[PDB]
């Protein structure tokens, strides 16, 4: 009820997580399949707060929040092991969910002339999408994406295949 | 050599044991098979004829080569914006090969210490040469295949250095003639320009946007399992597919099931199809005005 | 039946434990030898009477007892990767004729490489010091590891194989001391030849100060450069080097002395393209009609590699036609078209000098 009147947004981003997770048998009957993941963005108000709502209404299996900056580190190759091993964890956690904020920091696309530059950023994000493009599971763990700006296009052209349900704010009625 | 088995203070070796190493590097991927096959995709019959050529002709038809004196292809470049869906292509037909198959992720070769990826790739091609014939598939080569320009510094200079070491395994040493290795890249923007060769990247195929025939075909393959009310044009929405990726046709099906739920209708309808089309593409919103 | 008992009696001799390796630093007396283990600790021990004291010498690989920690047996030298640097194999010889061009480069490296070995007299008479080094670079064209490879399997004698990715070493860049020891065994098996593939990475500039890797790489480079700045005679050892771009190699390598000669591959002329096309038309069975000037007119600016892949593309396109002997019309079609696809993917082939 802390939502500010946004309904179609909260309805879609709700049925995309609760309904498949609360009543899995429903889709298995009608299957078809529910989408892999979602996307949120727009002006700051209100980002990341509807995420807190997903925390509240969250019933059983825990979900893992992931801030954007902890991916990028110096001494390259660290955030890669990171994202990989947290995916292995989520594959241990049986139907647990992941959320990403500030993805626009780590998904900067595409490149520059040189010398880079994006090369660590690229290998981390493209590595993320690489983990996303393996056939298994993937992931039965959903995902969640909330940011400010919709750019950049490389993760945004890699999402619509796996991910879906891009919804925009709205903003005060 | 190494690994020779010796017991503590004995400093004598009872048995010489193989083979090699190591954990994640030893087994990056051991694939049983993915269930999908080439029959699940459509519109690629020409380029999948080129693929099925490059992979299948060394397996069964090697005798034909030795009759004609033919050098088979090795590197085969795979590029296009998703989708396409070239990963289901390569891994589907990889499950149709029955030969040994190893998946691999491009950025995996980026490592913590200097040139770990080198011994990594050498171990990979060593177990590949052991399992010969075999197939190794890598993606996002352009992530590790950006040579940059000039010092300093390329943090991947060791990784791309290992790529040039793959060009040495394709250059100064012939034995890679067995176990064809396939590569895929979403964007051909940055490359090692030396990657052009038959042992290196040879058959190079652009994967375009699917065509309305192929779009309605493959989307019909995604919806063929689900209950559909037997009124669908596939022509109407095939033309309503503009700039779509086949993956966004999948999203059209997935959304068809989504609002098919909230409708309460037990079976899918065409208004649902065009609905989901409008849903995923193109975006939103503004308002209806000024155009009357 | 009795041979088994011979083996079992060998086990009775295996009840003797392996000894511990070490080096000879100095010797304080005849009963005091200043030694060090390969693992780092230093010791002073006497020894038995089976030694020859003068034969000991400082800087000597020896084996020590497990308790007395003293020399019983010794061996002069050992190196693991060497025999693997010698285990490279290449066919040809005849490939040295198969490569076509480039003639003046072929004969040039034949002179500066092979001639100091067989004929030091010609050089020592005129007063000229023999060049100890050379450089190759593609792919402005290609054929580096081919040409030089058939020089290693051509001249034979003693030759050493090096990939730049084996000097990585992870901890403690002692792959540097593997360059030192490697040069010492090149001073053992001399005359020897040294390959260097992909010398850009192990040739970098350290332009921007950064991280760790670049610094220790530059450290092994200091080892290289100062071992070509000798203090040593490298007359008897040969060094061949190949890399994409002769840019990041630093003025130290670009300086003569260390690197005397500079030779490149260029895009093959339609004459050499003609020739390499000839030798690539040999192994492939063809129809009675053959015209090479068709492909020579059509194919322009390819690498020699791109040209042989063009021939293979002709034949493997001709497995669709299922004909054993194949016309060169199918070769004009598939060669022409797919070759021009290679030229659409030929982006950014233009390299420095
Ligand atoms: N529509 C709304 N309904 C309920 N609360 C709102 C709404 N808009 C703003 N708020 C309140 O305003 C505060 C600020 O919004 P918030 O900080 O969550 O967005 P944000 O985190 O800045 O978005 P972003 O993550 O894109 O920066 C929140 O604590 C929230 O309670
Ligand atoms: N032409 C097509 N034929 C069949 N399926 C397709 C086609 N185009 C898209 N798809 C579907 O789109 C989905 C997403 O696949 P995607 O395009 O991400 O694979 P990909 O692009 O090869 O992988 P990557 O993104 O690593 O290159 C797949 O499940 C696939 O079934
Ligand atoms: N002049 C030539 N004659 C015969 N074959 C050639 C010639 N030039 C290139 N090739 C072919 O190119 C392939 C690779 O050998 P080469 O040493 O040229 O690789 P490279 O120069 O390291 O390639 P790149 O410079 O593109 O990395 C060989 O199979 C060889 O048949």
Swiss-Prot record, chain A:
Function: Component of the 26S proteasome, a multiprotein complex involved in the ATP-dependent degradation of ubiquitinated proteins. This complex plays a key role in the maintenance of protein homeostasis by removing misfolded or damaged proteins, which could impair cellular functions, and by removing proteins whose functions are no longer required. Therefore, the proteasome participates in numerous cellular processes, including cell cycle progression, apoptosis, or DNA damage repair.
Free-text description of this protein's post-translational modifications in UniProt: Monoubiquitinated by RNF181.
Family in the record: Belongs to the AAA ATPase family.
Binding site for ATP: 42-49
UniProt protein name: 26S proteasome regulatory subunit 7
Gene induction: Expression is not cell cycle-dependent and occurs throughout the cell cycle.
Gene it is expressed from: PSMC2
Subunit structure: Component of the 19S proteasome regulatory particle complex. The 26S proteasome consists of a 20S core particle (CP) and two 19S regulatory subunits (RP). The regulatory particle is made of a lid composed of 9 subunits, a base containing 6 ATPases including PSMC2 and few additional components. Interacts with NDC80/HEC; this interaction is detected only during M phase. Interacts and SQSTM1. Interacts with PAAF1. Directly interacts with TRIM5. (Microbial infection) Interacts with HIV-1 Tat.
Residues of the full protein shown: 175 to 347 of 433
Compartmental location: Cytoplasm
Swiss-Prot record, chain B:
PTM sites of type Phosphoserine: 229
Processing after translation: Sumoylated by UBE2I in response to MEKK1-mediated stimuli.
Cell compartments where the protein resides: Cytoplasm; Nucleus
Any one GO cellular component localisation term in the record: proteasome complex
Record keywords: Acetylation, ATP-binding, Cataract, Cytoplasm, Deafness, Host-virus interaction, Intellectual disability, Neuropathy, Nucleotide-binding, Nucleus, Phosphoprotein, Proteasome, Ubl conjugation
Binding site for ATP: 80-87
One GO-annotated biological process of the protein: modulation by host of viral transcription
Sample GO molecular function, one term: identical protein binding
Domain of life: Eukaryota
Subunit note: Component of the 19S proteasome regulatory particle complex. The 26S proteasome consists of a 20S core particle (CP) and two 19S regulatory subunits (RP). The regulatory particle is made of a lid composed of 9 subunits, a base containing 6 ATPases including PSMC3 and few additional components. Interacts with PAAF1.
Similarity annotation: Belongs to the AAA ATPase family.
Function: Component of the 26S proteasome, a multiprotein complex involved in the ATP-dependent degradation of ubiquitinated proteins. This complex plays a key role in the maintenance of protein homeostasis by removing misfolded or damaged proteins, which could impair cellular functions, and by removing proteins whose functions are no longer required. Therefore, the proteasome participates in numerous cellular processes, including cell cycle progression, apoptosis, or DNA damage repair.
Linked pathology: Deafness, cataract, impaired intellectual development, and polyneuropathy: An autosomal recessive disease characterized by early onset of deafness, cataract, severe developmental delay, and severely impaired intellectual development. Patients later develop polyneuropathy of the lower extremities, associated with depigmentation of the hair in that area.
Name used for this protein in its record: 26S proteasome regulatory subunit 6A
Gene coding for it: PSMC3
Segment of the intact protein contained: 148 to 439 of 439
From Swiss-Prot, chain C:
Record-linked SMART domains: AAA
Subcellular location as annotated: Cytoplasm; Nucleus
InterPro entries: 26S_Proteasome_ATPase, AAA+_ATPase, AAA_lid_3, ATPase_AAA_core, ATPase_AAA_CS, NA-bd_OB-fold, P-loop_NTPase, Prot_ATP_ID_OB_2nd
Keywords noted in UniProt: Acetylation, ATP-binding, Cytoplasm, Nucleotide-binding, Nucleus, Phosphoprotein, Proteasome
Protein residues bound to ATP: 138-145
Keyword Hydrolase: no
CDD domains: RecA-like_PAN_like
Principal localisation: cytoplasm
Modified residues (N6-acetyllysine): 36, 170
A Pfam family reported for this protein in Swiss-Prot or TrEMBL: AAA_lid_3
Function: Component of the 26S proteasome, a multiprotein complex involved in the ATP-dependent degradation of ubiquitinated proteins. This complex plays a key role in the maintenance of protein homeostasis by removing misfolded or damaged proteins, which could impair cellular functions, and by removing proteins whose functions are no longer required. Therefore, the proteasome participates in numerous cellular processes, including cell cycle progression, apoptosis, or DNA damage repair.
Protein name in UniProt: 26S proteasome regulatory subunit 10B
Species classification: Eukaryota, Metazoa, Chordata, Craniata, Vertebrata
């Amino acid at each position: 009820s802390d939502v500010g009147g946004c309904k179609e947004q909260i309805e879609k981003l709700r049925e995309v997580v609760e309904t498949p997770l609360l009543h899995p048998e429903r889709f298995v009957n009608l299957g078809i399949e529910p989408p892999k993941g979602v996307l949120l963005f727009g002006p700051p108000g209100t980002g990341k707060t509807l995420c807190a709502r997903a925390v509240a209404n969250r019933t059983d299996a825990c979900f893992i929040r992931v801030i954007g900056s902890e991916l990028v580190q110096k001494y390259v190759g660290e955030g890669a092991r990171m994202v990989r091993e947290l995916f292995e964890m989520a594959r241990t956690k049986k139907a647990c969910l992941i959320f990403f904020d500030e993805i626009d920091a780590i998904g900067g696309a595409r490149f520059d002339d040189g010398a880079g530059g994006d090369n660590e950023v690229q290998r981390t994000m493209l590595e993320l999408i690489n983990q996303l493009d393996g056939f298994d599971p993937r992931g039965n763990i959903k995902v969640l994406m909330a940011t400010n700006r919709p750019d950049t296009l490389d993760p945004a052209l890699m999402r619509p295949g796996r991910l879906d349900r891009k919804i925009e704010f709205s903003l005060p009625d | 050599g190494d690994l020779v088995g010796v017991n503590k203070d004995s400093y004598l070796i009872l048995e010489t044991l193989p083979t090699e190493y190591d954990s994640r590097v030893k087994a990056m991927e051991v694939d049983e098979r993915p269930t999908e096959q080439y029959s699940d995709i459509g519109g690629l019959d020409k380029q999948i004829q080129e693929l099925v050529e490059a992979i299948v002709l060394p397996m069964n038809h090697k005798e034909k080569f030795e009759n004609l004196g033919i050098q088979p292809p090795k590197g085969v470049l795979m590029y296009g914006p998703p989708g396409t869906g070239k990963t289901l292509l390569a891994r589907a037909c990889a499950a149709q090969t029955k030969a040994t198959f190893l998946k691999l992720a491009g950025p995996q070769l980026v490592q913590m210490f200097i040139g770990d990826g080198a011994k990594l790739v050498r171990d990979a091609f060593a177990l590949a040469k052991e399992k010969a014939p075999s197939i190794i598939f890598i993606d996002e080569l352009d992530a590790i295949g950006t040579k940059r320009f000039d010092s300093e510094k390329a943090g991947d200079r060791e990784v791309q250095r290992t790529m040039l070491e793959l060009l040495n395994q394709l250059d100064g040493f012939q034995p890679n003639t067995q176990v064809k290795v396939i590569a895929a890249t979403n964007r051909v923007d940055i490359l090692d320009p030396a990657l052009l060769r038959s042992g290196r990247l040879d058959r190079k195929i652009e994967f375009p946007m699917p065509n309305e025939e192929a779009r309605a075909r493959i989307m019909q393959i995604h919806s063929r399992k689900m209950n559909v009310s037997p009124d669908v044009n596939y022509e109407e929405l095939a033309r309503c597919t503009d700039d779509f990726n086949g993956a966004q046709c999948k999203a059209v099906c997935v959304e068809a099931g989504m609002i098919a739920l909230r409708r309460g209708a037990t079976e899918l309808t065409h208004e649902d199809y065009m609905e989901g089309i409008l849903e995923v593409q193109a975006k939103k919103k503004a308002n209806l005005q000024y155009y009357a | 039946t009795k041979q088994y008992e011979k083996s079992e009696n060998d086990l009775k001799a295996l009840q003797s434990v392996g000894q511990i390796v070490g080096e000879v630093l100095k010797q304080l007396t005849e009963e005091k030898f200043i030694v060090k283990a390969t693992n780092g600790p230093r010791y002073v021990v006497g020894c038995r009477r089976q030694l020859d004291k003068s034969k000991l010498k400082p800087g000597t690989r020896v084996a020590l007892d497990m308790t007395t920690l003293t020399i019983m047996r010794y061996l002069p030298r050992e190196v693991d990767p060497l025999v693997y640097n010698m285990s490279h194999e290449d066919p040809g010889n005849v490939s040295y004729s198969e490569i076509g061009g480039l003639s003046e480069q072929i004969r040039e490296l034949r002179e500066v490489i092979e001639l100091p070995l067989t004929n030091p007299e010609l050089f020592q008479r005129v007063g000229i010091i023999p060049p100890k080094g050379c450089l190759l670079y593609g792919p402005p064209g290609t054929g580096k590891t081919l040409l030089a490879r058939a020089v290693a399997s051509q001249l034979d004698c003693n030759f050493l194989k090096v990939v730049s990715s084996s000097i990585v070493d992870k901890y403690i860049g002692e792959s540097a001391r593997l360059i030192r020891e490697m040069f010492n065994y090149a001073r053992d098996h001399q005359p020897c030849i040294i390959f260097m593939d992909e010398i850009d990475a192990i040739g970098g500039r350290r332009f921007s100060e950064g991280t760790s890797a670049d610094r220790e790489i530059q450290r092994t480079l200091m080892e290289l450069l100062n071992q070509m700045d000798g203090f040593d005679t490298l007359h008897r050892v040969k060094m061949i080097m190949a890399t994409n771009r002769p840019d990041t190699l630093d003025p130290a390598l670009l300086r003569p002395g260390r690197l005397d000669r500079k030779i490149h591959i260029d895009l093959p002329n339609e004459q050499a393209r003609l020739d390499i096309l000839k030798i690539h038309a040999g192994p492939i069975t063809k129809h009675g009609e053959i015209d090479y000037e068709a492909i020579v007119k059509l194919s322009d600016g390819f690498n020699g590699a791109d040209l042989r892949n063009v021939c293979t593309e002709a034949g493997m396109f001709a497995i669709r036609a299922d004909h054993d002997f194949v016309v060169q019309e199918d070769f004009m079609k598939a060669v022409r078209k797919v070759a021009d696809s290679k030229k659409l993917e030929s982006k950014l082939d233009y390299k420095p000098v």
